[PDB]
Each structure stands twice: as C-alpha cells, then as structure tokens.
Design a binder for this molecule. Structure first.
Ligand SMILES: O=C(O)[C@H]1O[C@H](O)[C@H](O)[C@@H](O)[C@@H]1O
Ligand SMILES: O=C(O)[C@H]1O[C@H](O)[C@H](O)[C@@H](O)[C@@H]1O
Ligand SMILES: [Cl-]
Ligand SMILES: [Cl-]
Ligand SMILES: [Cl-]
Ligand SMILES: [Cl-]
Ligand SMILES: [Cl-]
Ligand SMILES: [Cl-]
Ligand SMILES: [Cl-]
Lengths: 389, 390
C-alpha cells in the first residue's frame, strides 16, 4: 500500500479535531498549579506515552559499565579534547555497546555544556578529524553537526550511531538490545514494551550516565538533539529523562511534535506500517484512529516543561506537517504558564526564516529541504546561549 | 469500507504456517503440569491478557444492581410455564438502561431448575409465540430458541436483548451503559476498557446476579448461550464469570473460538474495521498482525476448563472458519487433561451432521446456513443432560 498517494497537503482539507485537554486529569480535576501538574497530571501523561506509544524500557538499579577507550587532549590541532567511551547496554561485556564520541573545547573556563546528538551514521562522519579513518566517508555529515560552531560557543558535542543500540530494520527485535531483556518464554516485546525509538532514547540515557561522571562536562546543561526519526527519539529522551536541560526537535514531524489529529502528510498508519519496529505494539491500535488517541503530541512537549525545547521545521518537508509541529509547541503553553513562563510569542504559524525563541518554546520554519543545516545550528546555539551562559 | 468477504481466503491449502502460543507456558517460562499451577498462576495470566488486549475490563460492582419482578404469570403457555419479567437497573440512573429479562420456568417440576441464559438479537416477544405478549413479530425467532424442547427437558430459559446493555452500532460509546462508567475527565473507554462484547457479557453476569436469588432456579446449573457475535459474548461471559456451569458457542467464529492465525474467512482486521465498537481499543493493534497476538482462541476455550463447552459450526458458514472453530476446542484439551478429562474424541474435524459430545468439549458442524436451528438445540440439550441430570 502506497501512503504517499494518500497524503493530504491541503490545509483547507485538515479535519475538525479537539486536542485532549493537557490540564484535565483522568478523574476530572483541573490542574491550576505546578504542584498539581508535577504530583498528579504529568505522571498520568508520562504513563500514557510509555504504555501506548514508545513502550516501557528496562529500569536499571545501577549504572552499566563505561570505559574511556582513547583520549586526545590535542584533537583538531589543539582546539578540542576528543574522548571515545564504550558504554555497555547489558551486564554482558561481549553484548551490544555504544561507541560514544565526545568533543570538548580546550581553554574555556567552567564545566562545558554538551549537545548529546544521536546520529544516522558512524562517529567518523561527524567531522574530518584526521585521527579517525573509515573502513559514508570521514566528515560526510559535518554540515548537519557544525562542530566548529559548537566549539566557538564554548559547548561540547557527544554523538553515537543509533545502529549501536538497535539496527533500524524490522527483524522482530532478534538483533540489538531487545533480546537481552526478554524473560524466559519471551521471543518478543510485550505490547507495552519498547520499540526501536524507546531503545535509541534509552541509549541517550546510558550516554548521559557517562556524561554526568565527566569532570569537564556540566551535567546540568546537557541538551538532546536529533533529526527526523532521531528527532522523535530526542524529544522522548527529553520527556522520559528529565536530566536533559534542553531539547532540540529537528523536523521530528509525525509521532514527534506534529499534532497527529491533523492527519496532514505522514499519518500514524503510514508510520506504523512502513516502520513496524519504531513504536510499541500497542501504538498500532491508533492506525486511522487518531480521534481515539488518549493524548496528542502537544502533551509530549508538555512533558519537557519547564525545560526549554526548540522545534525546527523545513519549508519543503510537507510530509512532516510543519504547521502541526508549531501547533504541538502551541498546545504545551498552558503547562509552561504554570511555571510563570510565556509561550512561543505568536498566535499563527510565523513566515519562513522567522525564528521565535524569546520564550521557553522556540520555533522556526526555514527555507529548503528536510535536513539539519548551518542555519538551524545558528538558531539552536543562540537559543542554548540564553540558558547556558 | 473494503468488502472483506471478497478478499478473504477460504482455500484450506493457502492457510499460512503458524505456531499456537503455548497455553501451558507461563510468561516467565514455567510449564504447567498440575491443575494447581493452572488455577494459581497460568489461568490468571491468560485471563488478564484477554481482558487487557481483546475484550476490555468491565466495571466491578461492590453490590448487586437494583432489579424488580415487573410481571409474573404462573399460568403461562396454558399452565405449562411460569413467565417472569425482571427489570435490572444497569446504572445509578433509574431512567437509564435496564436489562428486561424474560424467564420461562416449566411448571410441574419439583427441584431447583437448570436455566439456559441466552442473549438475543431481538426483543423478548420474538423468543416464543406466547399469546400474552404483543409486538419483527411474536415468536419470529422460535426456531433459534426451541423453548418447547427446553421445557420438555425440565429446564427453563432466561433471555434479554443485547441492545438493552449497549446498542450494536458505532456511536463512539456515547449511548448504552458505557458513558455511565466514565470518570469526570473521560469521554471514551481507555484502550484496556470494555467495548460492546464485554458490556453484553457483563450484562449476562447482571442477569446471573438476579437468577441466583430466584428460589426456583438452580444457580449451580446455568448455561450461557449465544449465536455469532452473541456466541463470542457467551464464550467471554463463561470465561470471565466462573459461576456459569456450561457454555454454548453458536457459530462464534472469528475472535470467538476459531484460531486467528489460520487467517481463514473473517480476520482480526475485517472484524475491527467493520465493528470498531465490539472489542477494546488495544485489540486494534492486531489488525493484519495475528502472528503478534500474545494468545490465540484455544486459550479462551481453556478459560472454561474444567466446565463443559459445546462448539457448534454450520457447513455453509465459511466466514466463521469451521475447522478453526474445531481447532480452538482441540487446542484447549491440554488444560482439560490437567483435570483428568477427555478431549473432543476425534483428532481431525468430523464430517457434517456428526456430533461428538462424550468429552467436556463438544463439537458438531451441521448442514445448512449460519443460524441456530432445532438440530443444534437437540445436540445442546443432550449434552446439558449429561451434566444437569444423571
Ligand atoms: O527519519 C526520517 O528521515 C523520516 O523517515 C521517513 O520519512 C518517516 O516517514 C519520517 O517519519 C521520518 O521522520
Ligand atoms: O453476529 C454475526 O452474525 C456475525 O456478523 C458478522 O458476520 C461478523 O463479521 C461475524 O463475526 C459475526 O459472528
Ligand atoms: Cl478529535
Ligand atoms: Cl522493558
Ligand atoms: Cl553490553
Ligand atoms: Cl510490536
Ligand atoms: Cl436471537
Ligand atoms: Cl416471547
Ligand atoms: Cl471426560
């Protein structure tokens, strides 16, 4: 079945919908204080997303082993320190691990704020760093990481390849991390248990377990960032792991920050049928049934509150539903207001190349294609400066 | 809306290879060898799976609902029967939905009386051509209920129309009992809460709550029976309410007793797309994903063990998957064995008009159309006699 021919790109044809009320508890009590949000409502909304969309991840009692496998304090011609960190994902030392690559700027005062990116490609793609070689070449993804801009801001960048945690293909979860956490008599995750995206976002929490033990890293200023499917991951990492200080959604779109009820471009059915491994088994009940979601994506952004989040759209990325991305941001504003924080700063989706970033929810829709571009990183750094300086 | 009946496989050679989820294997890998392990560990796991992922949780009451005996005719059918109408209030609202239960008990019978509790497609007047009732038309469904045959066996019949509990149409659960059991911040069942079949089945449990207070009824000898969507319902009533002594599945088929993984005739997707109100939210995840079901329908029959179940198929009803219905029964035999009970008594699906009812699981596949006919009732009463008499 082709989902591209079924996509609506006509704003006039978007159906009627009502967002589920972010401030009304299941039992009817209206949240009017941050105390009511923190102690009652937020727990209900986290449980819905964990059970019905992303799936439960293993809850570890103790950290998994990490070893620093190589440091170069003089990387990039002395400008940076590069560390390679191996992060076990199981209590078997021959089981899957993350190869974490961390760049810290040399000669800045104070602990270093770090962007924890998750990447489509191996760590050697992040920068033409001559101390690395490639057995899809060295520095190939420089453009979507902008290491030089990050260093110039006094910030670090830690990345790993998501294929370390779970290969991005539908194999009935017999590769990657999943089979290590099955019970005896279990060949498959329960309907409420992690798919690929929850595994990747859990990966980012194992990366954070390392980063908070790093002397030069400010563990209170670790941002999470990803593009597209790794944008959906970064928002879930941010929502599920409140240690992260700032969330960057790069074109996260459908089942990221975009309102599902709009059914614009990609839909829940297009997503779950083309990528059956991404979300938990339970999520497949919402195929063609966005009406019956017990949440929408504005409540996922609400889980970030009061921490900042940057929503980035691309003007050509109609599949992502740029307007629905903005509206996922807008729908979270009532929760930020509990903390006496303002909103995006406008009522209508703003024009192209016009960032709003003076509130705790930042948004821009930029010219050109589905990507992370230098222009995006310009805006993310400017936003991050407001919190990290 | 795709015409699924056009697209369905009814060719036995094209049934996919599949493995049935093991009924005896607990989630943690422990195998059941004893009835004690079944009752204490495994049965509860399976019941929770079906309640969470297929039918949905129903309200649990702290007290029996209000009811009144509205009418009593101790001289019904020219003195052959006592007829009572019992109005059962399903909610806190007395202007809300009620079960209007009709109970026929044979006169001239001494003991407490065994009772078939049926759920019907149509109102009480359709059950029998009873001359003291008024308007399809009076006794239009007589052939599906055979009250004369039930009374002849010294058994009684209790029925109510399923529309009484929840209307059978997709109105987003804003009518029937559903909206009365919403929290103040809720406009729709949670994904793990009852759809229509679980409400209908809960309706039968409220009927049983009245029946057990009626001094003429033998509360230990109440059979549940339904046909097609009400067969699905009767099997769930029997699995979820252990008070029922005997379960009759009339052509219950897909998401009834038939094996889902055969993907033969009706499929999970055809079911949930055409009848989105029937099963809970969660069950929609299994649309075209039968291999990912954490169970199959042999485990639902297993929830009746050790109590008897009659599985009835029709020769023309290929939509229901008659061999799948046979194999659901076959698949539960390992659980009945823990109780030292036989199986159906044949290994492969028997030919038409060939009943097997010497085990705790009975089966026939009768000639003719999707229905309940006098033939079926003849077999059902012969089976009931084995348990309700000596
Ligand atoms: O990860 C990506 O690049 C994108 O892949 C597909 O286009 C998918 O439908 C999108 O949801 C996703 O954002
Ligand atoms: O209730 C009935 O008569 C039947 O109606 C339809 O055929 C439905 O698809 C069947 O599953 C059901 O058993
Ligand atoms: Cl809606
Ligand atoms: Cl888990
Ligand atoms: Cl490991
Ligand atoms: Cl799944
Ligand atoms: Cl009927
Ligand atoms: Cl009648
Ligand atoms: Cl026996």
């Amino acid at each position: 079945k082709d989902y591209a021919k079924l996509a609506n790109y006509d704003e006039s044809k978007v159906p009627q919908y009502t967002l589920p009320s972010v401030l009304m508890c299941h039992d009817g009590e209206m949240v009017q204080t941050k105390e009511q949000w923190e102690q009652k409502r937020r727990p209900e909304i986290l449980n819905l997303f964990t059970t019905y969309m992303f799936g439960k991840a293993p809850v570890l009692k103790h950290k998994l082993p990490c070893t620093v496998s190589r440091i170069n304090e003089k990387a990039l011609n002395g400008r940076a320190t590069r560390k390679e960190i191996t992060i076990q994902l199981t209590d078997d030392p021959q089981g899957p691990h993350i190869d974490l690559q961390l760049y810290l700027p040399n000669h800045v005062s104070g602990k270093i704020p770090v962007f924890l990116g998750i990447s489509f490609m191996p760590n050697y793609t992040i920068y033409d760093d001559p101390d690395l070689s490639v057995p899809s070449f060295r520095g190939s993804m420089d453009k979507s990481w902008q290491l030089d801009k990050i260093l110039e801001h006094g910030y670090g960048l830690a990345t790993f390849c998501y294929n370390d945690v779970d290969p991005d293909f539908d194999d009935d979860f017999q590769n990657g991390v999943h089979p290590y956490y099955y019970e005896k008599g279990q060949n498959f995750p329960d309907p409420d248990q992690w798919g690929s995206i929850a595994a990747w976002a859990w990966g980012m929490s194992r990366a954070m377990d390392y980063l908070e033990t790093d002397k030069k890293v400010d563990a209170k200023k670790v941002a999470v960032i990803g593009h597209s499917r790794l944008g959906k991951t970064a928002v879930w990492a941010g929502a599920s792991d409140p240690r992260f200080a700032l969330v960057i959604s790069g074109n996260s779109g459908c089942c990221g920050v975009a309102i599902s009820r709009r059914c614009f471009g990609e839909t829940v059915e297009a997503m779950n049928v083309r990528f059956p491994h991404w979300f938990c088994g339970n999520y497949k009940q919402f195929n063609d049934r966005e009406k019956y979601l017990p949440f929408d994506q504005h409540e996922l952004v609400a889980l970030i509150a009061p921490r900042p989040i940057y929503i980035a759209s691309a003007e050509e990325d109609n599949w992502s539903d740029q307007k629905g991305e903005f509206l996922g941001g807008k729908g979270a504003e009532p929760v930020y207001a509990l903390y006496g924080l303002g909103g995006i700063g406008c009522e209508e989706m703003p024009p192209v190349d016009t960032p709003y970033m003076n509130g705790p929810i930042a948004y821009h829709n930029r010219k050109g294609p589905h990507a992370v571009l230098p222009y995006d990183w310009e805006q993310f750094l400017r936003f991050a400066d407001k919190y990290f300086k």
